[PDB]
Design a protein around this motif. Structure first.
Motif, short mmCIF file in Angstrom:
data_model
loop_
_atom_site.label_atom_id
_atom_site.label_comp_id
_atom_site.label_asym_id
_atom_site.label_seq_id
_atom_site.Cartn_x
_atom_site.Cartn_y
_atom_site.Cartn_z
N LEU C 12 45.16 -22.48 20.23
CA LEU C 12 45.58 -22.95 18.92
C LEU C 12 44.91 -22.13 17.81
O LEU C 12 43.79 -21.65 17.96
N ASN C 13 45.63 -21.97 16.70
CA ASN C 13 45.20 -21.16 15.57
C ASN C 13 44.96 -19.71 16.00
O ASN C 13 43.85 -19.18 15.94
N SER C 14 46.04 -19.08 16.45
CA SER C 14 46.02 -17.70 16.92
C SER C 14 46.72 -16.80 15.90
O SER C 14 47.64 -17.23 15.21
N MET C 15 46.26 -15.56 15.82
CA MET C 15 46.80 -14.58 14.88
C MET C 15 47.64 -13.56 15.64
O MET C 15 47.21 -13.02 16.66
N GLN C 16 48.85 -13.32 15.14
CA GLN C 16 49.77 -12.36 15.75
C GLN C 16 50.01 -11.14 14.87
O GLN C 16 50.62 -10.17 15.34
N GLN C 17 49.53 -11.14 13.63
CA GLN C 17 49.71 -10.00 12.75
C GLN C 17 48.92 -8.80 13.26
O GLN C 17 47.90 -8.94 13.94
N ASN C 18 49.40 -7.61 12.92
CA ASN C 18 48.74 -6.38 13.35
C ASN C 18 47.39 -6.24 12.66
O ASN C 18 47.31 -6.16 11.43
N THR C 19 46.32 -6.22 13.46
CA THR C 19 44.96 -6.05 12.95
C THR C 19 44.32 -4.78 13.49
O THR C 19 43.09 -4.66 13.49
N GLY C 20 45.13 -3.82 13.94
CA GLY C 20 44.61 -2.58 14.48
C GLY C 20 44.35 -2.63 15.97
O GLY C 20 45.09 -2.01 16.75
N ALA C 21 43.31 -3.35 16.38
CA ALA C 21 42.97 -3.49 17.79
C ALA C 21 42.69 -4.96 18.09
O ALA C 21 42.13 -5.68 17.27
N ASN C 22 43.08 -5.38 19.29
CA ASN C 22 42.85 -6.75 19.72
C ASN C 22 41.39 -6.96 20.07
O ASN C 22 40.78 -6.16 20.80
N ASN C 23 40.81 -8.04 19.55
CA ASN C 23 39.40 -8.33 19.77
C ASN C 23 39.22 -9.84 19.89
O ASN C 23 40.03 -10.63 19.41
N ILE C 24 38.13 -10.22 20.55
CA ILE C 24 37.77 -11.62 20.73
C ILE C 24 36.86 -12.04 19.59
O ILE C 24 35.80 -11.43 19.38
N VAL C 25 37.26 -13.07 18.85
CA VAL C 25 36.51 -13.55 17.70
C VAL C 25 36.04 -14.99 17.87
O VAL C 25 35.21 -15.45 17.09
#
Lengths: 50, 202, 51, 50
Positions: C12-25
């Motif tokens: 839940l509350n996931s981001m799908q917009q392009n942020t350059g590289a996928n990372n765990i936050v």
């Protein structure tokens, strides 16, 4: 001794009384046992009540 | 005090109170008052009858590589525990308890004695322990253990308990508590008066 | 011989917009291993808390 | 619970069949650590593919 020898000439005894405050003082700083002060009950400084 | 080792006031009247009777001695609030006396006679030893220890076991501990149990090799047993036991004479027994993890959620307990030159090296299984799904002990924690005779004194028979012990992963095996009910003979040293009126001798 | 942990995982509350590289936050779990009592303390609210 | 950012412009992996030890078999790999009743650590790998 001059020949690296050690000899024992005895050990100092200790006496514990079953009840203090019964030792009547005698002149100089010595105490004499009597009634209500118990026997001397000689012992050793190693371990126990001493 | 006085010659008879009695609690006496400054004028010479004995002090009275609740007498202590029993083995072990304990205070009684239902007995008639009697003079209180501090005895000097040495007390005798009492044979250990109930010893209890707490051992934390590891769920991630692999089974020992050596299939047959050995008493002279450390890798043969997973955990070693030393317990002091006192007999009827005063001899001290350093009982060794060996915990071996044979399979999953199963432990074998072996007993050995070191103070007895004629003691037999343990080979068979003495106790079987199985824990719950969450590592909670269920049953089989009480074992009847008898030591070996030395100096012509009869062996001490007692109950060894591993209750309140869990096999949950704690990193390494550790013993957090160990108690027994045996004591060597002592000698009168000192006496102290508490705020409850009880007199306690060291 | 231990039963598997049957948990429920939420994204839940996931981001799908392009942020350059996928990372765990943000990652967490509700299961805790048994830990030894390091110490204890008292805070300004009057509570006694052990760590 | 966990939060992961997805790249909108990330293309579909070339190798359509899923594999366990192939870098191109999936887009992203993550690890989640959980604890069971006995306290053992269980590692769950979560693979994100397009």
């Amino acid at each position: 001794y001059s020949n690296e020898q050690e000899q024992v000439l005895g050990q100092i005894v200790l006496a514990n009384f079953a009840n203090n405050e019964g030792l009547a003082s005698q002149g100089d700083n010595v105490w004499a046992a009597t009634q209500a002060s118990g026997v001397a009950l000689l012992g050793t400084a190693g371990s126990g009540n001493f | 005090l006085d010659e008879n080792r009695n609690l006496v006031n400054m004028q010479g009247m004995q002090l009275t109170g609740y007498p202590a009777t029993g083995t072990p001695p304990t205070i009684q609030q239902g007995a008639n008052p009697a003079p209180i006396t501090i005895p000097n006679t040495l007390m005798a030893a009492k044979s250990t009858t109930t010893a209890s220890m707490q051992i934390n076991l590891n769920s991630t501990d692999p089974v020992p590589s050596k299939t047959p149990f050995s008493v002279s090799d450390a890798d043969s047993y997973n955990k070693k525990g030393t317990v002091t036991v006192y007999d009827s004479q005063g001899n001290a027994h350093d009982m060794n308890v060996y915990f071996v993890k044979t399979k999953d959620n199963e432990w074998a307990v072996y007993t050995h004695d070191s103070s007895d030159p004629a003691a037999t090296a343990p080979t068979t299984a003495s106790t079987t322990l199985k824990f719950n799904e969450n590592g909670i002990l269920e049953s089989g924690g009480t074992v009847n253990i008898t030591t070996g005779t030395i100096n012509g004194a009869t062996a001490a028979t007692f109950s060894l308990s591993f209750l309140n012990s869990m096999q949950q992963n704690t990193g390494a095996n550790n013993i957090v508590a160990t108690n027994q009910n045996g004591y060597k003979p002592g000698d009168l040293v000192s006496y102290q008066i508490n705020n409850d009126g009880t007199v306690v001798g060291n």
